[PDB]
Amino acid sequence: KEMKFPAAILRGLKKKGIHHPTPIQIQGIPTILSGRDMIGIAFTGSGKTLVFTLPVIMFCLEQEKRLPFSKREGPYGLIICPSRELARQTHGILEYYCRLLQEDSSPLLRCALCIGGMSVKEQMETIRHGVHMMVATPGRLMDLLQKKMVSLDICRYLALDEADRMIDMGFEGDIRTIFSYFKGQRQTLLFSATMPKKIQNFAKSALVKPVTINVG
């Protein structure tokens, strides 16, 4: 409730005609920080980044200000994608905003990519040094979790992007497996282009008392 976006965001949102936005609401529309799980039907890139990515980045920045003496590897937030290409571009966007918000007087948030087809070079440089946000595909993530190579203990925010596509592609078992590695409570956002029965049921499994934003 006391959270504010810094001036680069507030400036750029104002150019678009968005006045008085906060990390908990965008012109009265809730984000993932307002205490509810969410189902987001037919969102574009830009809508997803207002309701999920920017508000979670702010959460990361606030947590960084008073850390415990003995630190934990994050991430604080996780985005699960259907594909390598989509994970990489989603990961490039997060890095873009992470760079934008450092230059508003701070140190740099680090985003991990967790997908197949990463060289060992790419695998080391992402995971070791710090991880605040992670972007992954379901198979690779599951395998990292089971091999105890990644931890979800402080991960509060989860987005499932294109869950319809993920389920179509046969990743549902893999996502449920990932659900079982959350020890604490998560706030979960589900994105989908459409909402047939198949996904309605997966959402019942995956979410608790969700708010629904449907722009189809």
Residue numbers in the entry: 184 to 399
Could you pull the original sentences from the published paper?
DDX41 consists of two RecA-like domains (i.e., DEAD and HELICc domains), which are conserved among DEAD box proteins. In this work, we determined two different crystal structures of the DDX41 DEAD domain in apo forms.
In contrast to DEAD402, the crystal structure of DEAD399 contains four molecules in the asymmetric unit, and their N-terminal regions adopt two different conformations. We hereafter refer to this conformation of the N-terminal region as the “open form 1”. We hereafter refer to this conformation of the N-terminal region as the “open form 2”. Moreover, in both open forms 1 and 2, motif I forms part of the extended α3 helix, which sterically clashes with the modeled ATP. Therefore, these results suggested that the closed form represents the ATP-bound state of DDX41, while both open forms 1 and 2 represent its nucleotide-free state.
